[PDB]
Design a protein around this ligand. Structure first.
Ligand SMILES: Nc1ncnc2c1ncn2[C@@H]1O[C@H](COP(=O)(O)OC(=O)[C@@H](N)CCCC[NH2+]C(=O)OCCc2ccco2)[C@@H](O)[C@H]1O
Ligand SMILES: Nc1ncnc2c1ncn2[C@@H]1O[C@H](COP(=O)(O)OC(=O)[C@@H](N)CCCC[NH2+]C(=O)OCCc2ccco2)[C@@H](O)[C@H]1O
Ligand code: MG
Ligand code: MG
Ligand code: MG
Ligand code: MG
Lengths: 270, 270
């Protein structure tokens, strides 16, 4: 019989495609040696052939998709003023407020892309023709209980449009074209959150890929926005989790422990 | 005569290619209106044509260069254990130690990529053939006096090789092939730093593009490295500064104030 420590170690080395059972009586060593060989060969093939990191590669694929559809690529600060949190309507006694990583006294790691993108929409409206279409991909941060679907350090895509064409129909059509491009099935369900109000959540089974919003909303005034807008935020690690059938989202994260979902800890267990 | 406030505002709107003088007596308005028109047209053309962010585009170009030359693309954590700082030989009473953004009690924003990459080298050595070649591009953080050449939030490339081929000659040859690819002239000068010891600094005039190291070094033991290695770190914003002849590195940074070196603040000054 395998101990919990042993079972945990074999789970680390097991990949979704494997058809190997941890409950069929084989000694821990036979199982560990088999899996280590498979994972070493997996890394050897990546190194010999493509050499691209899944998170980087997905960012690049997504970037191409939105640039080709007329959206401006944004790269904004990750370390942001703490004041942006308050101004997003996140009161400091709320749950999301307790998820913020504070830095020094007056800054934080951004938990979302929206405030920076709201500032870009306002500013670009002075220069660009209608409709204004922009997107950003990059790191975001939230203190979490984690579990299998949450990370403290994750990667968000947020695209948005402001001016004409900002209807629920167009928003759903963009989401549909995007997830069709990635080859991911989904449904849309109505939900709500404290910050934006009513949302359209993009679901893969019970897993939330995205929350999306059809503006305008009352918050807009605080960011100097006064036109219709639509936008959606997606977690890249969640997209990878679905695409590669990972059981735990940690396999898709920035990590020292996994590379393209393959364990980097290829020592023997004792 | 222009006030300091006026001169500063016009400097924000001026771009390197402009042949417009702020010292030839024209009223502030004539100058401000001219520059605003140029910058709006610059943004309009980016939006109509390419839509790519310089920092993102450069990351993608660099990634392709190193992947095609046999280096594995790494995406590791930005938020790292504070203990990694100590173990890099950065004592807490040193100057670099005072540049660290601490997060909670036991973490920090990484000020460099090396510790994460050292862990990857050690781990991948259990799986990959000689030589092991890896690189990472991403955000790094240092409290700075700033000025025209430093940012608190910047983007580093670090490539490294471990095993065979880890000579000064090969390191210089990679650096040369890389900067030749980017179309940037440079020289190499010997320097030294507290962490790695003797370095080879890659200079464009008086501007440091990179520090590079030929190992092994005594620090290696603390990271479980015991083979020869070579590596170099480059700032992407510094590369952009040179490529686009920016006067201030802030034009190349993740920002809400500049997009591809063009001011996003296109209001009228009073
Ligand atoms: N902990 C953790 N780990 C992994 N993935 C995670 C995660 N937490 C979230 N995700 C993934 O991100 C997606 C979106 O997160 P969310 O909390 O549901 O939604 C928001 O953060 C929100 N900002 C998304 C965009 C809403 C539309 N708003 C917008 O476009 O604003 C644009 C500009 C503007 C105008 C006025 C105001 O702002 C999760 O679904 C998950 O995948
Ligand atoms: N504040 C600020 N703003 C803009 N750009 C900045 C900046 N500070 C630095 N830069 C740019 O980064 C380049 C490198 O920074 P550095 O301090 O000179 O050098 C280092 O950080 C160092 N880690 C670079 C790599 C050295 C080689 N080491 C390595 O490859 O390790 C690999 C693994 C290993 C094995 C054993 C131990 O580790 C600046 O030149 C500037 O452009
Ligand atoms: Mg949540
Ligand atoms: Mg949601
Ligand atoms: Mg320095
Ligand atoms: Mg240096």
């Amino acid at each position: 019989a395998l101990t919990k420590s042993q079972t945990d170690r074999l789970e680390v080395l097991l990949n979704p495609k494997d058809e190997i059972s941890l409950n069929s009586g084989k000694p821990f060593r036979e199982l560990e040696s088999e899996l280590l060989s498979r994972r070493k060969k997996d890394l050897q093939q990546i190194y010999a052939e493509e050499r691209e990191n899944y998170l980087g590669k997905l960012e690049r694929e997504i970037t191409r998709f939105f640039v080709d559809r007329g959206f401006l690529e944004i790269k904004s600060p990750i370390l942001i003023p703490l004041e942006y949190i308050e101004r997003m309507g996140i009161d400091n006694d709320t749950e999301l407020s307790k998820q913020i990583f504070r830095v020094d006294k007056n800054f934080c790691l951004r938990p979302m892309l929206a405030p920076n993108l709201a500032n870009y929409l306002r500013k670009l409206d002075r220069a660009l023709p209608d409709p204004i279409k922009i997107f950003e991909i990059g790191p975001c941060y939230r203190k979490e209980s984690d579990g299998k679907e949450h990370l403290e350090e994750f990667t968000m895509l947020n695209f948005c449009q402001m001016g004409s064409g900002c209807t629920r129909e167009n928003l759903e059509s963009i989401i549909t074209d995007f997830l069709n491009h990635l080859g991911i099935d989904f449904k849309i369900v109505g939900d709500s959150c404290m910050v934006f109000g009513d949302t359209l959540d993009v679901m893969h089974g019970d897993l939330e890929l995205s929350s999306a919003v059809v503006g305008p909303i009352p918050l807009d005034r605080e960011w100097g926005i006064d036109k219709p807008w639509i936008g959606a935020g997606f977690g890249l690690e969640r997209l990878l989790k679905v695409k590669h059938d990972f059981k735990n989202i940690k396999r898709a994260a920035r990590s020292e422990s996994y590379y393209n979902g393959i364990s980097t800890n290829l020592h023997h267990h004792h």
